[PDB]
């Protein structure tokens, strides 16, 4: 019906530029103010910019003034955001939105990741245990997303928690995967995390051994 279809975004280096697009259908595009709103990872919503129906009136958030430029092409039913001089703090899902009295139609979201990293496979380190014992693997310093982790080649699923990746200040991702198991099993069962980072073709199987030190 009424729809806003986003494209653009993805990976960019600090200081670099990206252009986001938003294609509108199902309503009279030229008669509405359009907006961009962003959401940093694990955080709330921040308005970025607005543009009036005929581009007479343009508004920017304090945090993007002088770097981002909003525009629209009413004849193509399209909204744009030219983002320049990108920084780590601009890493976020960016949404286009129509405004009437509230933001009443939203795009699907476009992820923008600002990092100087090249493709790099992770190092995998043990998180070693010492009724129930917890063990895991730290999957550190990889780019881009994603990595997959299983345990015991998929035969161990119960009690597994693989955390969402966090972008570190180095521009590389890290995550841990953990599992809780009965401590009585630690002396008889083997626990192995299977890590695959397909962008770098990096596959590791790490058996996690109980430690005391």
């Amino acid at each position: 019906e009424v729809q806003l279809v986003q494209s653009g975004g993805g990976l960019v280096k600090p200081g670099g530029s990206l252009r986001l697009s938003c294609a509108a259908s199902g309503f009279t595009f030229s008669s509405y103010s359009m907006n961009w709103v962003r959401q940093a990872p694990g955080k709330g919503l921040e308005w970025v910019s607005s543009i009036s129906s005929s581009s007479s009136y343009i508004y920017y958030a304090d945090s993007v003034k002088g770097r981002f430029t909003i525009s629209r092409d009413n004849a193509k039913n399209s909204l744009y955001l030219q983002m320049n001089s990108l920084r780590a703090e601009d890493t976020a899902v960016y949404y286009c939105a129509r405004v009437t009295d509230a933001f009443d139609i939203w795009g699907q979201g476009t992820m923008v990741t600002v990092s100087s990293a090249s493709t790099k496979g992770p190092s995998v380190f043990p998180l070693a245990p010492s009724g129930t014992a917890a063990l895991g693997c730290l999957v550190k310093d990889y780019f881009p997303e994603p990595v997959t982790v299983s345990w015991n080649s998929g035969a161990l699923t119960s009690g597994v928690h693989t955390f969402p990746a966090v972008l570190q200040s180095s521009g590389l991702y890290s995550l841990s995967s953990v599992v809780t198991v009965p401590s009585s099993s630690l002396g008889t069962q083997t626990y192995i995390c299977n890590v695959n980072h397909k962008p770098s073709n990096t596959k590791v199987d790490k058996r996690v051994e109980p430690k005391s030190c």
């Binding site: 919503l45 009295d101 933001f103 795009g107 380190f125 917890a134 841990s176 953990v178």
Partner: protein
């Protein structure tokens, strides 16, 4: 600008409950208040605009009321689809500003985190870097505070947290906090402690280890 603060940060609800969320403005916004719903990995959706008006297609178990600086969103008979984050938003003045959100999640009993502390591997230490990981496992509700201490010094600015979505089987959360130190700094200190505050704990629990010790 106009600061919007929502309360509580999370509400525990069961299927069929009535849920009431609160939003407060730092100054008067008249009727210019909207409410949105967000589910994991999805864009927000408008529910209510101008404080009380239902958007097209939105189910009539959602109502809003209030004006000035005080507003509420009521869900009158919660369905499985309504477990989500809810945001308010002021359209009185530019910049439009959002509240920080309220997560309506599945009610279960309070479960204290099982806390585990993991020293850096010797593998990693070889490379000049030390990651210390604190696991908070299978807890409820989601609100939890992790304080790192190194030789009793309260750490800030050098840890990162990551949290799971509510588990489908047991309705709990888990959280990792990771402290990142140079190998040099790690070698300069003895006691590495993870102190955890949570509703399921009568006073904060400290898990710790001593570098080099068994």
């Amino acid at each position: 600008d106009i600061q919007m603060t929502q309360s509580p940060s999370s509400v525990s609800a069961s299927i069929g409950d009535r849920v009431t969320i609160t939003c407060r403005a730092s100054q008067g916004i008249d009727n210019w208040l909207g409410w949105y719903q967000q589910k994991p990995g999805k864009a927000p959706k408008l529910l209510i605009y101008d404080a009380s008006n239902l958007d097209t297609g939105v189910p009539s178990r959602f109502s809003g009321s209030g004006s000035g600086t005080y507003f509420t969103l009521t869900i009158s008979s919660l369905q499985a689809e309504d477990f989500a984050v809810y945001f308010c938003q002021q359209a009185k003045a530019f910049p439009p500003t959002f509240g920080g959100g309220t997560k309506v999640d599945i009610k279960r009993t309070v479960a204290a985190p099982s806390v585990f502390i993991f020293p850096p591997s010797d593998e990693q230490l070889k490379s000049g870097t030390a990651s210390v990981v604190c696991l908070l496992n299978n807890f409820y509700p989601r609100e939890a505070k992790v304080q790192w201490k190194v030789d009793n010094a309260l750490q800030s600015g050098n840890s990162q947290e990551s949290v799971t979505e509510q588990d489908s089987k047991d309705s709990t959360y888990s959280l990792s906090s990771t402290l990142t130190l140079s190998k040099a700094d790690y070698e300069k200190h003895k006691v590495y402690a993870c102190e955890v505050t949570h509703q399921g704990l009568s006073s904060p629990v400290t898990k710790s280890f001593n570098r080099g010790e068994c």
